[PDB]
Design a protein around this ligand. Structure first.
Ligand SMILES: *[C@@H]1O[C@H](CO)[C@@H](O[C@@H]2O[C@H](CO)[C@@H](O)[C@H](O)[C@H]2NC(C)=O)[C@H](O)[C@H]1NC(C)=O
Ligand SMILES: *[C@@H]1O[C@H](CO)[C@@H](O[C@@H]2O[C@H](CO)[C@@H](O)[C@H](O)[C@H]2NC(C)=O)[C@H](O)[C@H]1NC(C)=O
Ligand SMILES: *[C@@H]1O[C@H](CO)[C@@H](O[C@@H]2O[C@H](CO)[C@@H](O)[C@H](O)[C@H]2NC(C)=O)[C@H](O)[C@H]1NC(C)=O
Ligand SMILES: *[C@@H]1O[C@H](CO)[C@@H](O[C@@H]2O[C@H](CO)[C@@H](O)[C@H](O)[C@H]2NC(C)=O)[C@H](O)[C@H]1NC(C)=O
Ligand SMILES: *[C@@H]1O[C@H](CO)[C@@H](O[C@@H]2O[C@H](CO)[C@@H](O)[C@H](O)[C@H]2NC(C)=O)[C@H](O)[C@H]1NC(C)=O
Ligand SMILES: *[C@@H]1O[C@H](CO)[C@@H](O[C@@H]2O[C@H](CO)[C@@H](O)[C@H](O)[C@H]2NC(C)=O)[C@H](O)[C@H]1NC(C)=O
Ligand code: NAG
Lengths: 269, 208, 84
């Protein structure tokens, strides 16, 4: 609002506390973001690791497991996803969990569900050969385990073809990640309009404080200062309210994602 | 009984409401650019044709503060309603019945739940079953006998080095293999992992 | 100490890693011993003994009771304009 002007600071000081009130909302927003990420991804207690030899009955997970050669330790699909997507008193704070930690959580979850079935979500992980876990799941959907054992190779080939096709479709066709792009664009546009609002007269004679101070006498310049102050404060309030609404909707989506991870990954729904 | 801060959520709600009320009532002591913060002073110092401007400034400032307070209250009420709907679903699904969706109520296999009243909320006590003291075993997906393949009706084949019993999947309880807890499907030439063994039946010993 | 979050004075950087209690940011946080800052650890690491012909079966059980607390209501308030 003031931009290093003592007169503006003194004039603004007589509006009481609107600013602690404003910052107390942004702080809550940031803490909520961190809690969202933590409650979505930190579903496990130990970091599981896949065995060096990989013979999962013919199923081929090589496209999803992490690749130690790459420094990021991300997988093929994660790299495709990451590549596919694109100072005036404002600060951006880094998230608590870096991307390597999130990748490590995903890798732990995925190795656990490959090796131990769904048992690792209740107590301690218990090993089980993968084909037997598939037989259990077939029994779960109302089909006898006979069918799986009598058709293992065909099922494995169909799974591998499906995973290859999904990789190819994600690699070639764009615009498949519209939601995250929309979120990013909305946030960037909000910041852009907030910073652009700084160049409006708001009924004053100029949009820069130095000209106001260096062209008139303070008893009459204070009027223009007041107009600028009230306009900028109004814009800030609108921005904060929009941020609160958007944060509420993101929290709803995060809760849904957490329930999906708990139910459809740690068990059979 | 001993550990405190176990009820952080309700305390947070109460503190948020109290602080909002406190700042709303504290906002009454701001000039908002006028000459004073009390109406009687400006009334008893200036002639009304010029005091009406200061009165207008106070009016607009206080009205804006009230508007912001009401909007914040609406946001918080929406969030609380979401939480109340979640609590109602939990009380309907985990108290009036045994829930099957994993991790909805309790960290483990759900058994039952009990409600307790709280000053502005509810407390659920979830009773859950957790396995422990596991053991290693060797496994096979089917048993070839007389050229046919046998699969377990319900359970899994295990062996303590030998003797190949069947158990249930969540509690070690070995049992001999009989034609009553297994079923047959095809010949033992296509499955990958079958082992040779014998399957006993009671009709022949009952015959003699 | 200089980190991706900024600059930290009054703490000693170590090479160990423990659980996080006072989150600082960019994957680091601090704790009291003096005050030490470190890289947070995501938890203990174990390698489950996978094999294509081996399983594990529990032999005993435990019964656990846990709590969860939910808010359901807030205080009902009303405001009169003209008085305010
Ligand atoms: C699992 O699938 C991957 C492909 O996604 C296989 O890796 C390919 O193997 C062929 C055969 O030599 C090579 O020509 C490709 O260059 C490999 N691709 C990559 C990305 O390395 C892999 O062999 C499969 N797993 C098994 C056990 O066969
Ligand atoms: C596997 O378990 C079976 C069932 O308990 C064992 O069979 C009996 O074990 C007892 C205990 O030593 C012996 O006294 C009996 O003679 C066994 N019965 C038969 C028919 O052999 C079996 O010994 C166990 N095997 C191992 C390697 O632990
Ligand atoms: C399960 O894993 C074992 C590894 O212990 C596999 O046994 C190997 O089979 C190949 C091909 O038949 C042989 O070349 C290896 O020498 C075997 N390993 C050992 C240690 O003998 C086995 O094929 C896998 N699958 C099944 C169904 O048992
Ligand atoms: C289970 O028993 C059958 C026969 O009782 C075994 O089948 C024999 O296998 C050997 C080696 O492959 C062949 O030379 C014989 O001709 C087979 N005989 C018959 C009648 O099929 C079978 O190998 C045994 N299972 C295992 C795992 O060894
Ligand atoms: C089950 O069998 C494994 C195989 O020998 C036992 O040994 C463990 O194997 C894993 C994977 O190689 C190692 O990470 C552990 O360190 C091994 N244990 C020990 C004590 O060294 C294992 O102990 C057996 N029991 C269980 C409950 O898994
Ligand atoms: C299952 O676990 C329970 C509890 O850990 C065991 O009961 C304990 O047994 C020991 C030895 O007999 C006693 O000293 C304890 O007092 C018992 N605890 C309780 C709460 O009664 C039980 O023996 C275990 N059963 C098996 C088969 O492992
Ligand atoms: C231990 O940490 C210090 C700085 O805290 C660093 O200079 C030193 O190289 C580290 N040593 C090892 C073995 O990591």
């Amino acid at each position: 609002i003031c931009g290093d002007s003592t007169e503006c600071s003194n004039l603004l000081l007589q509006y009481g506390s609107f600013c602690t009130q404003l910052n107390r909302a942004l702080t809550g927003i940031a803490v909520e973001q961190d809690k969202n990420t933590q409650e979505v991804f930190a579903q496990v207690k130990q970091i599981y690791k896949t065995p060096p030899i990989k013979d999962f009955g013919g199923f081929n997970f090589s496209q999803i497991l992490p690749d130690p050669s790459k420094p990021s330790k991300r997988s093929f699909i994660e790299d495709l996803l990451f590549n596919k997507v694109t100072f005036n008193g404002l600060t951006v704070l880094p998230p608590l969990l870096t991307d390597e930690m999130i990748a490590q959580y995903t890798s732990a979850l995925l190795a656990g569900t490959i090796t131990s079935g769904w048992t690792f979500g209740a107590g301690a992980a218990l090993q089980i050969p993968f084909a037997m876990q598939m037989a259990y799941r077939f029994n779960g959907i109302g089909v006898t385990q006979n069918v799986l054992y009598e058709n293992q190779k065909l099922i494995a080939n169909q799974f591998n073809s499906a995973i290859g096709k999904i990789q190819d479709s994600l690699s070639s066709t764009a615009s498949a990640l519209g939601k995250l792009q929309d979120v990013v664009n909305q946030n960037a546009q909000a910041l852009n309009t907030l910073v652009k609002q700084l160049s409006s007269n708001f009924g004053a004679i100029s949009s820069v404080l130095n000209d106001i101070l260096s062209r008139l006498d303070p008893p009459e310049a204070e009027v223009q200062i007041d107009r600028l102050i009230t306009g900028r404060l109004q814009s800030l309030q609108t921005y904060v309210t929009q941020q609160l609404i958007r944060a509420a909707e993101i929290r709803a989506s995060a809760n849904l994602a957490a329930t999906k991870m708990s139910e459809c990954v740690l068990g059979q729904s | 009984s001993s550990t405190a801060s176990a009820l952080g959520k309700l305390q947070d709600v109460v503190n948020q409401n109290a602080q909002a009320l406190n700042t709303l009532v504290k906002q009454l002591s701001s000039n908002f650019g006028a000459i004073s913060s009390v109406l009687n002073d400006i009334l008893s110092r200036l002639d009304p044709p010029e005091a009406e401007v200061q009165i207008d400034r106070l009016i607009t400032g206080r009205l804006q503060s009230l508007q912001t307070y009401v909007t914040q209250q609406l946001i918080r009420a929406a969030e609380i309603r979401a939480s109340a709907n979640l609590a109602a679903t939990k009380m309907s699904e985990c108290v009036l019945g045994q829930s099957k969706r994993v991790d909805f109520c309790g960290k483990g296999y759900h058994l039952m739940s009990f409600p307790q009243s709280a000053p502005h909320g509810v407390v659920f006590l979830h009773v859950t079953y957790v396995p422990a003291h596991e053991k290693n075993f060797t496994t096979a997906p089917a048993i070839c006998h007389d050229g046919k393949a046998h699969f377990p009706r319900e359970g899994v084949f295990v062996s303590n080095g030998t003797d190949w019993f069947v158990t249930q999947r969540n509690f070690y309880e070995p049992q001999i293999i009989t034609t009553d807890n297994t079923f047959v499907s095809g010949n033992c030439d296509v499955v990958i992992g079958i082992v040779n063994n014998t399957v006993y039946d009671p009709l022949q010993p009952e015959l003699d | 100490f200089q980190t991706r979050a900024g600059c930290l004075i009054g703490a000693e950087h170590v090479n160990n890693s423990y659980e996080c209690d006072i989150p600082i940011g960019a994957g680091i946080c601090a704790s009291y011993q003096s005050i030490i800052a470190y890289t947070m650890s995501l938890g203990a690491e174990n390698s489950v003994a996978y094999s294509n012909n081996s399983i594990a079966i529990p032999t005993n059980f435990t019964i656990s009771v846990t709590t969860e607390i939910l808010p359901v209501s807030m205080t009902k308030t009303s405001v009169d304009c003209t008085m305010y």
